[PDB]
Structure formats: structure tokens, C-alpha cells
Amino acid sequence: MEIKTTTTLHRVVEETTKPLGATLVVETDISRKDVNGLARGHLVDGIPLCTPSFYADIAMQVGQYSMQRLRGLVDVSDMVVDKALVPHGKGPQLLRTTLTMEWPPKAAATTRSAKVKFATYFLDTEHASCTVRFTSDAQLKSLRRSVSEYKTHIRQLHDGHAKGQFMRYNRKTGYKLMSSMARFNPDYMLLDYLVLNEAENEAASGVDFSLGSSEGTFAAHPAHVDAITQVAGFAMNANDNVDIEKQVYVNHGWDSFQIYQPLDNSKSYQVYTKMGQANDLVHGDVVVLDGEQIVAFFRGLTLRSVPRGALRVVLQT
Amino acid sequence: EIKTTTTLHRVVEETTKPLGATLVVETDISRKDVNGLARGHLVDGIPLCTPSFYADIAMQVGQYSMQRLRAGGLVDVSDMVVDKALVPHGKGPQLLRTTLTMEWPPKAAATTRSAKVKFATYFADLDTEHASCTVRFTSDAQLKSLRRSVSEYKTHIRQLHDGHAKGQFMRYNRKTGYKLMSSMARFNPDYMLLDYLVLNEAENEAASGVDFSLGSSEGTFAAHPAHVDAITQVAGFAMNANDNVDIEKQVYVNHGWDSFQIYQPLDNSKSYQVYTKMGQNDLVHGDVVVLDGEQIVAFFRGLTLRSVPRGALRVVLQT
Numbered sequence: 001m002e003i004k005t006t007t008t009l010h011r012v013v014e015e016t017t018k019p020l021g022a023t024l025v026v027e028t029d030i031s032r033k034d035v036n037g038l039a040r041g042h043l044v045d046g047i048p049l050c051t052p053s054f055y056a057d058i059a060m061q062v063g064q065y066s067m068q069r070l071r072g073l074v075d076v077s078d079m080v081v082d083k084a085l086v087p088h089g090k091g092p093q094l095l096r097t098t099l100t101m102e103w104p105p106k107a108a109a110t111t112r113s114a115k116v117k118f119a120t121y122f123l124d125t126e127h128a129s130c131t132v133r134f135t136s137d138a139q140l141k142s143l144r145r146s147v148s149e150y151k152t153h154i155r156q157l158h159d160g161h162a163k164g165q166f167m168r169y170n171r172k173t174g175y176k177l178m179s180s181m182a183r184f185n186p187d188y189m190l191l192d193y194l195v196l197n198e199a200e201n202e203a204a205s206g207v208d209f210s211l212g213s214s215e216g217t218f219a220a221h222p223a224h225v226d227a228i229t230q231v232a233g234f235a236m237n238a239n240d241n242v243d244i245e246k247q248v249y250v251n252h253g254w255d256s257f258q259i260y261q262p263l264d265n266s267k268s269y270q271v272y273t274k275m276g277q278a279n280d281l282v283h284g285d286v287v288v289l290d291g292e293q294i295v296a297f298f299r300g301l302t303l304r305s306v307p308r309g310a311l312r313v314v315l316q317t
Numbered sequence: 318e319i320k321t322t323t324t325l326h327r328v329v330e331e332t333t334k335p336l337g338a339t340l341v342v343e344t345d346i347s348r349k350d351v352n353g354l355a356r357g358h359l360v361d362g363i364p365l366c367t368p369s370f371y372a373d374i375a376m377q378v379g380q381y382s383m384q385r386l387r388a389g390g391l392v393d394v395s396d397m398v399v400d401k402a403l404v405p406h407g408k409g410p411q412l413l414r415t416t417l418t419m420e421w422p423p424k425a426a427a428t429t430r431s432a433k434v435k436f437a438t439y440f441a442d443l444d445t446e447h448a449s450c451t452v453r454f455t456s457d458a459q460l461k462s463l464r465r466s467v468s469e470y471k472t473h474i475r476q477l478h479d480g481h482a483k484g485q486f487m488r489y490n491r492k493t494g495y496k497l498m499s500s501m502a503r504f505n506p507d508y509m510l511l512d513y514l515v516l517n518e519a520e521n522e523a524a525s526g527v528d529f530s531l532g533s534s535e536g537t538f539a540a541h542p543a544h545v546d547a548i549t550q551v552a553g554f555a556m557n558a559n560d561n562v563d564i565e566k567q568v569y570v571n572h573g574w575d576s577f578q579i580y581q582p583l584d585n586s587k588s589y590q591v592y593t594k595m596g597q598n599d600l601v602h603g604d605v606v607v608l609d610g611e612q613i614v615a616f617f618r619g620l621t622l623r624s625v626p627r628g629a630l631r632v633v634l635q636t
């Protein structure tokens with residue numbers, strides 16, 4: 001019955017079932033040595049930051065649990081990041097995840113979504129929220145039919161590079177290109193290579209999870225998931241016309257995220273995205289493949305253009 | 318005469334004698350017409366004067382001394398050694414004094430072919446000794462040799478472009494290249510003159526198009542500091558842009574060079590082709606050639622870069 005504790009889910013604070021719904025509150029001390037390093041995924045202006053993928057992992061966990069006890073794909077949807085979470089590492093820093101569900105009398109078994117909120121307590125700060133959904137395989141089946149199409153897009157990008165049309169970045173050079181904006185926890189530096197067609201903010205990347213350490217138990221390793229979103233972040237910020245000393249594209253959230261095959265830390269995967277031009281926001285889909293197999297998919301991944309200076313000022317505040 | 322220019326403000330001392338002579342000139346790097354120019358690179362928020370700044374002044378005091386001791390010449394800024402960083406504070410006057418000294422037999426001075434030059438800052442009524450070099454009134458032997466190798470340099474350049482066209486080498490557009498180096502150093506906009514650069518990392522070999530029309534370069538000079546620094550930037554980028562070089566830990570910085578000659582004016586409206594093969598203690602060296610189509614424009618022989626810890630660099634500059 002009880003939910004399994006993991007590297008990213010440490011304790012159950014509250015769990016109460018009710019006739020018209022239920023509530024599940026879990027806790028994670030992001031200062032604990034087995035997870036503190038992981039909670040510090042990005043580094044901006046010397047300030048450590050927790051990535052959206054961190055919340056997504058916990059969401060999948062409390063979602064998969066809730067879905068299994070009222071009765072198989074869990075979609076971490078409508079992800080919204082409101083305030084940065086800085087893992088200070090000075091004693092306990094409790095991140096509380098609250099999941100809530102509602103349903104008509106004796107109809108709990110048909111519930112297909114739940115609201116999730118993420119906030120730290122010493123209330124400290126409300127950081128993010130999302131809606132976990134127990135979705136259908138309609139999208140998966142659709143993606144499977146488009147596999148050859150994605151493969152062709154990927155192939156065309158490599159052919160373009162082979163003709164000197166698009167840039168191909170080796171891992172260390174790509175991270176170097178982004179280094180004035182942000183540095184990454186070594187365990188998060190999983191992009192092996194990336195071919196970028198700047199004209200369409202379109203990229204094909206090889207992500208190799210064997211390039212980092214990922215010990216622990218998770219639903220979806222935060223480093224693996226963040227790596228997937230990094231392909232889109234790089235596609236935007238690596239454009240010749242984007243001056244990262246003045247304006248940069250940062251994570252905002254996403255509309256939908258589904259994983260169909262476990263994210264193996266010994267394997268490499270192919271990631272493809274065409275973000276496009278796009279007010280203040282840009283959005284696009286990101287697909288992950290393992291050869292001919294559909295592994296995961298972000299629908300509506302959203303990035304926001306913000307002043308580099310303002311970003312710094314806020315983080316330093 | 319010793320015409321004053323944007324980088325040479327006034328004569329502090331000039332004494333000619335039987336066994337030689339001395340020429341001391343002064344440059345207030347805070348003056349509005351040259352202050353921005355003296356701030357070529359920015360490392361950890363600290364502005365830095367580039368070696369090319371000294372080279373410009375050296376060419377000036379050198380050309381002057383040369384044309385003066387003769388009844389009529391290529392000036393080589395050789396043995397350039399940069400000892401201490403020069404940080405243009407912009408807090409009032411900052412006097413950079415250039416001292417040139419010559420020596421010769423009692424017979425005739427018209428045969429003098431070199432002069433010692435030193436660069437150091439002094440307060441208003443010594444601050445730090447920054448660099449030194451030996452200006453030489455050289456022959457055209459090297460120029461003639463370089464002209465015979467033009468087709469060879471052209472082929473190296475062509476091969477780099479052909480490699481890129483096959484996906485073998487990286488080609489960096491101007492802004493992307495500066496972005497790649499931005500965590501290590503930022504540049505005065507007038508110094509961001511590299512239009513594109515094709516790099517063969519295996520041999521730290523690069524072919525770059527430098528376009529002087531990409532920056533502002535108003536004023537009078539012998540060799541504009543931004544133009545000359547841009548030439549050396551091709552080699553600096555070739556080294557620091559290697560995938561195996563982690564600029565968060567180690568970086569290749571300017572050290573100086575053995576020889577530098579300019580054969581054609583460095584026109585601020587033109588673009589030029591720059592080629593270097595730096596190849597593999599803590600020092601690396603190589604030659605850098607500048608072409609204008611089929612014409613040899615300039616040449617650095619023995620340009621030297623030094624590998625230094627990124628953090629140590631920061632600590633030193635902050636001090």
C-alpha cells in the first residue's frame with residue numbers, strides 16, 4: 001500500500017483519504033548527501049539551481065502511486081515553474097510536494113488527474129505546480145507512426161552538417177558555448193553531440209546517459225530528463241543572433257511530458273526538436289528515440305526570453 | 318618631428334649623443350580619444366591593455382628613429398615580452414611612458430639597425446613596468462620569402478574550407494566565436510573584428526576572415542591596436558576553442574612574439590585572410606600570416622601563448 005521512498009522522495013508527511021477526494025503530502029530534504037548534488041543541476045552566476053526535471057521526477061512518483069492505489073501512463077502535464085529553488089546546503093531544506101485529487105462518490109477508480117504543488121518549508125517559498133494525468137496511449141501510437149518522419153528530420157540535419165550547412169557541437173564545446181550563461185553539474189552534462197539548424201531553431205542531439213553518474217532510485221532521473229530539455233535550451237541560446245550577455249532563454253515549464261521506456265543510465269538516445277521563431281515565450285515539442293523506438297515526448301516545452309542582467313539580479317536576491 | 322597620435326601624446330625627453338640616443342614619449346591612456354581603445358579585453362570584469370597597444374607605439378618611435386638617423390624601411394617589432402598586465406582604471410590620468418634607446422660607434426649612427434623599447438606606467442609627479450621589445454630596421458628577405466609561399470598559404474586556407482564543406486572542421490560565425498570565449502574574456506566592440514574562422518582542432522590550425530569594417534577605428538596610428546590584436550586573436554581562438562581545452566580551468570593567454578612585420582597598411586575598410594598552424598613546458602608558439610588576396614600584408618613569427626590556470630589568472634588580475 002505505502003509509497004516507496006526514493007532518492008528524491010524521503011518521507012510521507014500527510015496522507016488522508018476522503019469520500020470526495022484525497023490528499024498526499026511527501027517530503028524531500030534536498031540537503032541530504034545522496035540527493036543534494038542532484039538538486040544542484042544548473043549554476044547561474046555562482047548560484048545553484050534546482051531544475052524542473054527534479055519536480056517532474058517526484059510528480060511521476062506520487063502520480064504513479066496514486067494511480068495504482070485507486071485501481072498506466074503518467075503524464076506530468078501543465079508544468080509551471082514560478083520561483084527558483086536554490087539548494088543552499090546549510091542544514092535541512094525541506095521541499096514539500098502536495099498532491100490532491102477529487103471525485104464523485106465511489107468513483108475514485110476513474111479519476112484521471114491530480115493537482116501537484118511544490119514548495120519549501122523551514123512555508124518558505126512556492127516554487128512550481130503541475131497536473132499529473134493518467135493518460136491514454138493515443139499519443140504514443142501516433143508518435144510510433146511518425147518515427148520514420150522524425151528519423152528523416154534527424155538524417156537531414158546530419159546530411160546538412162556533412163555539407164557544411166549546419167553546426168555540429170561536440171559535448172565539451174557546446175557546454176563551453178553556454179558557460180557564460182550557465183554551468184552544469186557534471187552529472188547533467190549528458191549531451192554527446194548536437195547538430196543545429198539555426199534558421200529553424202531545429203536540433204538533433206545524441207544524449208548519452210553513461211556520461212554522468214546517476215546512483216539512486218527515481219521514477220525518472222532528474223539529470224536524464226533535464227538533458228532532454230537541454231537540447232531545446234541549447235537550440236535557442238546557441239543561435240548566432242542571440243547575445244547571451246544580454247538576453248537568454250530559460251526554462252518556463254511545459255504542457256505535457258510522457259516517458260514510454262525507462263531512461264537507462266547505460267544507454268544513449270536520439271533527441272529531436274524544432275522550436276521555431278515564436279511575444280515573450282517560445283514553445284515546441286521534443287521527441288526522444290532509441291533507434292526505432294519512441295522513448296519519451298515533451299509536448300509544448302516552453303522557454304522564456306529574459307534579460308541576462310535581470311536574471312542575475314533576481315537570483316542574487 | 319615625432320608626430321603625436323592617438324596612441325603617442327607627447328615627448329617627455331629626447332637626448333642625442335656621441336654613442337647613442339634616448340627618446341621618451343608619453344601616452345595618457347585615460348584621454349577620451351584613446352581610453353576606450355586601451356581597454357581591448359575584459360577578463361573577470363577587469364579591463365586590459367593588449368600587447369598590440371605597445372606594438373603600435375613601438376612602430377611609431379621606431380619608424381621615427383629610423384627615418385631620422387638616415388639621409389634617405391621595414392620596422393620589425395621583435396622580441397615582444399609582456400611582463401605585467403596594464404589595467405586602464407579611467408580614474409584620472411594614467412601615464413604610459415615608452416622609452417627607446419639606441420647605441421652606435423662614434424663613426425656613424427646611420428647604420429644602427431635596432432633599438433630597445435620599454436613600456437611602463439608612471440604617476441603624476443614608476444607605477445609598473447609592463448613590457449619590452451626590440452624594434453629592428455630589417456631587410457625584405459622575409460617578405461620576398463613570404464611572397465614565394467603565397468600559393469602555399471592559399472592552399473592551406475582552401476583545404477580548411479574544403480574540410481568544413483565536408484563536415485570535418487568547425488566554422489564559427491563572428492558572434493558565436495566570441496560567445497564561445499565569453500566565459501574567459503569579453504572584447505571591446507572595436508576589437509570584435511573576426512568575421513569567421515574555420516578550425517582544424519587536431520593541429521590548432523585556423524583560417525579566418527578578419528573584417529576591419531566591423532569595428533570603429535578613428536584616430537591616428539602606425540598600426541591600429543584593434544587591427545593588430547584581431548590578427549593575434551586568430552591564434553588565441555585556435556588554442557582556446559579546442560574541445561580538449563577547459564577554459565574554466567586552463568586558458569592560453571598572450572605572452573608576446575619573436576617578430577612582427579607589416580607590409581601593407583591595415584585599412585579599416587578592408588577584410589583580410591589570416592592563417593595560423595599553432596600545433597601542439599607551458600608555452601606554445603607559431604606563425605600567423607595575413608593576406609589580402611594574393612598580397613602578403615603582415616606576419617607574426619613566433620607568436621607565443623602561455624597556458625595558465627583560469628583561477629590563478631583571476632586572482633592575479635583582481636590583485
Ligand SMILES: CCCCCCCCCCCCCCCC(=O)O
Pocket residue numbers: 042169170171172173174175176178182191192193194229230231232233234237249250251252
Ligand atoms: C552538445 C551540446 C552540449 C551543450 C548543451 C547545453 C544546454 C544548454 C541549455 C540552456 C538552458 C540553461 C539555462 C538555465 C536557466 C533555466 O533554464 O532555468
Ligand SMILES: CCCCCCCCCCCCCCCC(=O)O
Pocket residue numbers: 358489490491492493494495496498502511512513514549550551552553554557569570571
Ligand atoms: C570567428 C571567431 C570569433 C571569436 C574570436 C575570439 C578570440 C579569442 C582570443 C583568445 C585570447 C584572449 C585571452 C585574453 C588573455 C590574454 O591574451 O592576455
